[PDB]
Each structure stands twice: as structure tokens, then as C-alpha cells.
Amino acid sequence: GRSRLLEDFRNNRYPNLQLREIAGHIMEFSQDQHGSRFIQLKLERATPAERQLVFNEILQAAYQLMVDVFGNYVIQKFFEFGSLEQKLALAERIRGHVLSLALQMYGCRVIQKALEFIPSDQQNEMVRELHQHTEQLVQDQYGNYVIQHVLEHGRPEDKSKIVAEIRGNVLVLSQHKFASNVVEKCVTHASRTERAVLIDEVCTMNDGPHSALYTMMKDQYANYVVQKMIDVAEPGQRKIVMHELHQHTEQLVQDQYGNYVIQHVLEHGRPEDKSKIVAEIRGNVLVLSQHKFASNVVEKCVTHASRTERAVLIDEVCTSALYTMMKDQYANYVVQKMIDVAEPGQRKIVMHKIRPHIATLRKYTYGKHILAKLEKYYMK
């Protein structure tokens, strides 16, 4: 059913086609996978008159195109390169349907592009329609992305309304697959008072099987919220959060999701918190390096601990444990990190233990990675 023009374009018959040559076929091209991309790349360098001619053929079906798999990109580009009254015309079609679009797969991207390029007075009239269903949007598969956009670029009063909607549900929404992204953006972009209240909510003692903080640290989605809370919490609330983390470090370094929080503390935390984590895995480097989840924790300890702590962690393996670790799929990366970070006096000891197995390492998958990394310092 395609026109001969669109079929020729898809078959690469017109290498230098222009927007003027597809007049009368803009709707057909916008709904085609390759024709839509043609309008996109051309929409950025055409005169406003040429854009207006393209805009004329899609105005009546603009609301249809906003949810189309391929036509929505043409609507997005008109927000990114169209004139003022064109964006006001597109925004007028969205008025009354902001909720319906924000919940759609491609409509949520049209809503984001709209709030990004339309004047502020139209952003306000559009974001006020979002505040009516904030609780519904933060948990939606696509509505949460619109709420995140307001938390990153909206007005502080708009962010306060979103924070107030999250208040009292911080624990539950942190564990939600999509609301966790919204809760994290609140901790990042709310005021220091608002985010201190949100952090304080999960710092309260509850009667649940685990504390609110410990439950979040081991949760699939809420642990990403804990990491952001650790970054921004004031020293008072920070000591409370880190205290709960230290009480469960042994389980967290091996948990499927808790190990990420431990890694975050090792990368960005205070040296005192890093030292207590190093002290916990100290004595178990061999076992934890072969663990599918705890191996990345041990690797971060070798990378971020102090020189004296690294010396003890590295010497613990040298007294063989290195052979078992080089043959392991997870512990292999721990050995390579130890070679890079060890002081030259201790690196000689590590390379002296790897030396008897050099001829056998090439059989293992990562043995090449070990030999190529040994070549950087061995006998140099």
C-alpha cells in the first residue's frame, strides 16, 4: 500500500532526497520506520517555511502521531526545532490529555520533550495537570519518567508537591520497580530539609522483620536509594544510616543486592567506613573472592583501602591461594587488581607466587589477561 515515493526511498533510489520532494506524503513517511527518520534528520536544517509545510500535513493527526511508534519522533523534533506557535499548537492538543500521554510508551517521551522546549507558562499549565495524579504517575512504567523530569528541571514548588506525595511511603515506594527512580530523584533534588525528612522516615525504628534501612539495602530497587541517601545525608543522619550498614556487613557483602551498597561505600565513603568494611572481609579474601557476589566487594577493597590495609589483604593470599584464585572465574579479577596496586616490594612477592604457574595459565580463559598484566611489571 506504500506510495512509489516511500518504496523508492526505502530501496535507496533517492540518496539526496529533500523534504520538498515528499509533499503530500508526510503522514505516510512519519508513520514509516525509515521515512520518519528521514523527516527527523532533515527537520533540523530546513527553513521555518519548509517546517511549516511539514507541520501542516501532521497537525490534524498530531495527537495520533504522539503515540505512534515512529510518528512520535517527528512530534519530538518539532518541539526541538519548530517555531513558537507550532509548539503552542502541539501543546494545545496535549491539554486535557497529559495524563493519558504520560502513561503511554511513546507519549511519555512527547511529554518530556514538550516540557523541555515550550515556554514556562505552558510548562506550568502542563505540570499542574500532572500534580493531580502524582501518586499514579510515580508507579507507572512510563509515568515515572515524566515525574523524574520535573524533579530534575521543574520548579522547587513542583518538586515539593512530589516530595509531599512520597512522604509517608518512602519505604514501600523505594522497593517499587519504577517508583524507586522517583524516590532517588527526590533525595537528589529536594531541599536539604525535605530530603532530611525523607531520610528520617526510614531511620525510624519499626517492628518489621528487618529495619527499614537494612530492608532497603538488601532490596533489588531500594538499595539504589540507600546509596543516594548516604551521599547527601547530614553527619547526624549519616552516622545512623552507616551504623545500620555496619551491623549487617557480613550478610550485605554476599547478598545479591546488598553488595552494591558496600561497593558504593568503598568507592565514595569516608576512610573510616572503608576500614570497617576491609576489616570485615579481612580473613576471608580467598572464600569471598570465589563468591559470585562478594568477589566485587573484595576487588573494591583492594582498590580503595589504605596502603597498610592493602598490604595485609594481599599478604593474606600469598601465604597456594593465588593459584586457586587465578583459576576461578570471579577471584581472577581480584588477583589482577592486587598486581596493579601492590607496592613494588610486595608486587615482587605476588609475581613470585604466580611464577611457577605461568606455563599453565594460558589454558584458562583469563590467563591471558594475567600474563598481559604481568608483562607490565614482571622483571622490569
UniProtKB/Swiss-Prot annotation:
Linked pathology is:
Spinocerebellar ataxia 47: A form of spinocerebellar ataxia, a clinically and genetically heterogeneous group of cerebellar disorders. Patients show progressive incoordination of gait and often poor coordination of hands, speech and eye movements, due to degeneration of the cerebellum with variable involvement of the brainstem and spinal cord. SCA47 is an autosomal dominant disease with a highly variable phenotype and incomplete penetrance. Clinical features include developmental disability, ataxia, and seizures.
The organs and tissues expressing this protein are described as: Expressed in brain, heart, kidney, muscle, intestine and stomach. Not expressed in cerebellum, corpus callosum, caudate nucleus, hippocampus, medulla oblongata and putamen. Expressed in all fetal tissues tested.
Pumilio repeats sit at 21-56, 57-92, 93-128, 129-279, 165-315, 204-352
Q: Where is this region: Uracil-nucleotide binding in RNA target?
A: 72-76, 144-263, 223-336
The record lists the effect of residue 355 to W as: In NEDMSF; likely pathogenic; results in reduced PUM1 protein levels and decreased post-transcriptional repression of E2F3 and ATXN1
Ranges of residues in domain PUM-HD: 1-378
In its UniProt entry, the species of origin is given as: Homo sapiens (Human)
Instruction: Summarize subunit and interaction data from the UniProt record for this chain.
Output: Recruits the CCR4-POP2-NOT deadenylase leading to translational inhibition and mRNA degradation. In case of viral infection, interacts with DHX58. Interacts with TRIM71 (via NHL repeats) in an RNA-dependent manner.
Q: Give its localization.
A: Cytoplasm; Cytoplasm, P-body; Cytoplasmic granule
**Induction line:** Strongly down-regulated in keratinocytes upon UVB irradiation.
Let me see what the UniProt entry remarks about domains: The pumilio repeats mediate the association with RNA by packing together to form a right-handed superhelix that approximates a half donut. RNA-binding occurs on the concave side of the surface. PUM1 is composed of 8 pumilio repeats of 36 residues; each repeat binds a single nucleotide in its RNA target. Residues at positions 12 and 16 of the pumilio repeat bind each RNA base via hydrogen bonding or van der Waals contacts with the Watson-Crick edge, while the amino acid at position 13 makes a stacking interaction.
Region described as Guanine-nucleotide binding in RNA target: spans on this chain: 180-299
- By what name is this protein known? Pumilio homolog 1
Query: Function of this protein?
Result: Sequence-specific RNA-binding protein that acts as a post-transcriptional repressor by binding the 3'-UTR of mRNA targets. Binds to an RNA consensus sequence, the Pumilio Response Element (PRE), 5'-UGUANAUA-3', that is related to the Nanos Response Element (NRE). Mediates post-transcriptional repression of transcripts via different mechanisms: acts via direct recruitment of the CCR4-POP2-NOT deadenylase leading to translational inhibition and mRNA degradation. Also mediates deadenylation-independent repression by promoting accessibility of miRNAs.
Transmembrane spans = none
Region annotated Adenine-nucleotide binding in RNA target, chain positions = 36-40, 108-112
